[PDB]
RNA sequence: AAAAUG
RNA sequence: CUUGAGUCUCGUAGAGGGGGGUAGAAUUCCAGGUGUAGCGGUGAAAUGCGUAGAGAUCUGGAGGAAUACCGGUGGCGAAGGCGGCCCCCUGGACGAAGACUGACGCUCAGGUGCGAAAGCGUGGGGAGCAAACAGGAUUAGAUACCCUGGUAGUCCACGCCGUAAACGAUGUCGACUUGGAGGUUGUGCCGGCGUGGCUUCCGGAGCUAACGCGUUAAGUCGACCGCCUGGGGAGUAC
């Protein structure tokens, strides 16, 4: 659910939550926990090397199975589960030989449902298959760009992918971006969207809110002075440049893509 | 005129009678008036929709350009 | 339970897979509780106008009697089968146990 | 709408007799029964007003016979309603 | 409206059979009527014109039934 | 070129214009004409007449081509409908099918609003 | 085609 | 008590509503083939598109929106409204035999719900159309009509708005009062003869300022409600 917050202090009166009862409110599975320390941005250099990251709040990694080859064994679903690391919900599923594995959640999924993978596996939400398995048109989420390596794609809250076509041995896929890729249609998918597609409705409310997720304040270029960016400078607000990263490459419109090892899977650009 | 499912008990038009069918439709596949073919409103409304069924099964074609 | 008139369509290329279809498809129905009250198989035909690119289809006409979660799957079994190429399920006020037309 | 079988059921229940058709309590009863029914109807089609129209004239129905059994006899009403599970 | 000529069958009398094929399917009117976006409203007023009219022309055509002009 | 004794006209006939191509069996064009290319520019352009000297013109351009029968596609409302048959009749070609091909739909898209003249 | 006013 | 009102039984017709799926036609776009100098548009033009190959024609693909014919002073719905086909859920109406309840009815200030199109909010979608906007014409001017383009919007989900010449400019319920021709939908008997429901046209008495209405009354009565009181100012101000 969204739920509006009442307006009873200032840093109250615009946030807008998501949620859900459907939730786990113990502890996650402990066996798939890690710990995952924080970066400050910084490389091994110790250099900022992308701005706008510290602080926030501590967080465990939930090892969560994007690859889903456990193929022929039906599993369960046991709970859904809060996963700080990203905006999809996780779902805790336990296989009939007792083995337990955190998958993401897809929309619909719940409690007592059952899902599967393999080739011979059911078409239904939750279910993992080869693509050239599943029906040219259906709606799809984390999936393999390699056969094997696990799912890269529509993994966020809400996101999904269409296979619109099949041709041989690759799919073309339409990605959320709007581009259209292809992929070999041995790589899996998942059937379904990702869940939480309400996700992108919250409002965070106050600055507090981002430094809790650990985003740090941006400065925007103006307000600075010219030995620290091409925008600095000025007797009051002045521009007069045509914007640019604070490296001084175009920042409205300048196209960055260069990979000329991967322009044959692009059938059309996000456009 | 004479309406020729009043004049034979006809429950309904069977969208499978593909025989009977073609008597209500034109060369170029469209419904033909129940004016020119004397038909009753009700086996009129009862022969367009066996009419568009068979069009659906490709029993009938839609039109003659297909 | 509900009368249904069942025609499906089969690619001409899987004509000889038909017999199997048409057991499996009355042995979910019957394993239902259902009653098959006709059954045709109309064989190829000459398509009115060409779906798929194809200019011909194996016809099959059943009548059966089922409850409807069994007919939900059976048209799910048809939206997934890709030698289906069409499929039409209707609703009967009683059971048709005749001579279609076609035959 | 409500099946022969459900029908004939909540006449032979409330009525005194599988004729007994058109007493308060029969149609009280059959009214109640099609209102409950179509409350998951309603918690899914939350848009069919057209239907809704035909489900509240059911209520008023119910309304205007329970209290015509209210001024009749009002032992008949309280077995009734509480039998039906009704407030009022 | 597909004409094919027959032997022996010139070229105007094919002709002849393509246009009764067009007008039978009415092909011109079909064009001319949804050349232009015709209103709900408009179109609803055209039809009952269209009814009214043919139903006043017969009352005037069997009432002057009975009238003498001389 | 090669040739073909066996094509297809299609006649293009606006209210505006006519335009006439004559392809072969598989749509590959030949020679066009039109009336509007044809010595008519305006009022005379949407003419029978104009349509006709368009027809004779197209069979002109693909004389080279051996083309003795013709399938003709007769497509939209304009005044060189008929005008067109007969003059490709005239030019020797045998007609052996005329069929019209006016898109007609099974009502579709919102046409443009009426013109308040 | 345009075509106001008293 | 059973005649008003309702319940049950069997059946009938229906674009009644909600959800889901699907078919074929067409427009547009994208890729390619053939082909060559025009296309498009108007009262006439021009803007625009086209030798960087358009328009035309053929093939393959994408996508959205609407469902030709049927189709009808045809049908359904309280009104607003509702139109391909298929399924699921669901509302009402009507008819024939009966059986049942036994005045349980009618109307309704306030209240509550529904309520075209446009509009508004959030999130999607966007083919075609198209306010705004731009250009071209026309003209004395032309913030228009016409042309070439084109954005909200039109579409979907959810919420809001609550208004229309939302009209039959005719409140709801009931009774009574000559006819004629039709439509549509039941049903009884034997093409004919009946008998119900809804509906279109004409018309008699009567009514009406007239125009007209005229058994679906604007006739003759009864019940309850809404509303009017010269034109403007004003359905405006507060
Ligand atoms: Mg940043
Ligand atoms: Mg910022
Ligand atoms: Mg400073
Ligand atoms: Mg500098
Ligand atoms: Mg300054
Ligand atoms: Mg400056
Ligand atoms: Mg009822
Ligand atoms: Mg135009
Ligand atoms: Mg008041
Ligand atoms: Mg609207
Ligand atoms: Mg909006
Ligand atoms: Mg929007
Ligand atoms: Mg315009
Ligand atoms: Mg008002
Ligand atoms: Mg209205
Ligand atoms: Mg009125
Ligand atoms: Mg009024
Ligand atoms: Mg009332
Ligand atoms: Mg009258
Ligand atoms: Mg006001």
Known sequence: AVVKCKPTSPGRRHVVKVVNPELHKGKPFAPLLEKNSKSGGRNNNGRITTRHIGGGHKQAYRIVDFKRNKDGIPAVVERLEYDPNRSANIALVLYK????????????????????????????????????????????????????????????????????????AYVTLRLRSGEMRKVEADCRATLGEVGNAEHMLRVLGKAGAARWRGVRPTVRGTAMNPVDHPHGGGEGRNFGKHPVTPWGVQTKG?????????????????? | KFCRFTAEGVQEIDYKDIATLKNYITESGKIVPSRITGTRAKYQRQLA?????????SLLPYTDRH | ????????????????????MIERYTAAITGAEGKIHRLEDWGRRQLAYPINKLHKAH????????????????????????????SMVMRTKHAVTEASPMV | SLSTEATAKIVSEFGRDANDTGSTEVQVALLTAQINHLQGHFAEHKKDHHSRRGLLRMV????????????????????????????? | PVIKVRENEPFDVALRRFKRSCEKAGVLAEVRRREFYEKPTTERKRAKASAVKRHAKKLARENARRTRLY | ????????????????????????????????????????????KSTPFAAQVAAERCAD?????????????????????????????AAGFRITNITDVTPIPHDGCRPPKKRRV
């Open chain 6, 1 to 44: 070129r090669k040739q073909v004794s066996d094509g297809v006209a299609h006649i293009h006939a606006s209210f505006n214009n006519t335009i006439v191509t004559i392809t072969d069996r598989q749509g590959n064009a030949l020679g066009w004409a039109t009336a509007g290319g044809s010595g008519f520019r305006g009022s005379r």
């Open chain 3, 59 to 86: 016809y099959v006409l059943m009548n059966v009697e089922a409850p409807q979660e069994v007919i939900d799957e059976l048209e799910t079994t048809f939206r997934f089968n890709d030698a289906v190429i069409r």
């Open chain 6, 61 to 89: 351009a693909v004389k080279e081509y051996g083309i003795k029968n013709l399938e003709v596609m007769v497509k939209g409302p304009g005044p060189g409908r008929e005008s067109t048959i007969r003059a490709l009749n």
């Open chain 2, 49 to 57: 929709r066996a009419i568009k069924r068979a069009r659906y099964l």
């Open chain 1, 97 to 168: 030989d007792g083995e337990r594995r955190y998958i993401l959640a897809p929309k619909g999924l719940k409690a007592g449902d059952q899902i599967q993978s393999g080739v011979d596996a059911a078409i239904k939400p939750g279910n993992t298959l080869p693509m050239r398995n599943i029906p040219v048109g259906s709606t799809v989420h984390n999936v393999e760009m390699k056969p094997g390596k696990g799912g890269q794609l529509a993994r966020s809250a809400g996101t999904y992918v269409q296979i619109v076509a099949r041709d041989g």
């Open chain 3, 1 to 20: 339970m509900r009368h249904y008139e069942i025609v499906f369509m089969v690619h001409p290329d899987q004509s000889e897979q038909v017999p199997g």
């Open chain 4, 60 to 88: 008023s129905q119910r309304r205007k016979l329970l209290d015509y059994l209210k001024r009749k006899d009002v032992a008949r009403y309280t077995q009734l309603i509480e039998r039906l599970g009704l407030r009022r």
């Open chain 1, 254 to 271: 300048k196209k960055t893509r260069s990979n000329k090892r991967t322009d044959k899977f692009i059938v059309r650009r996000r456009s």
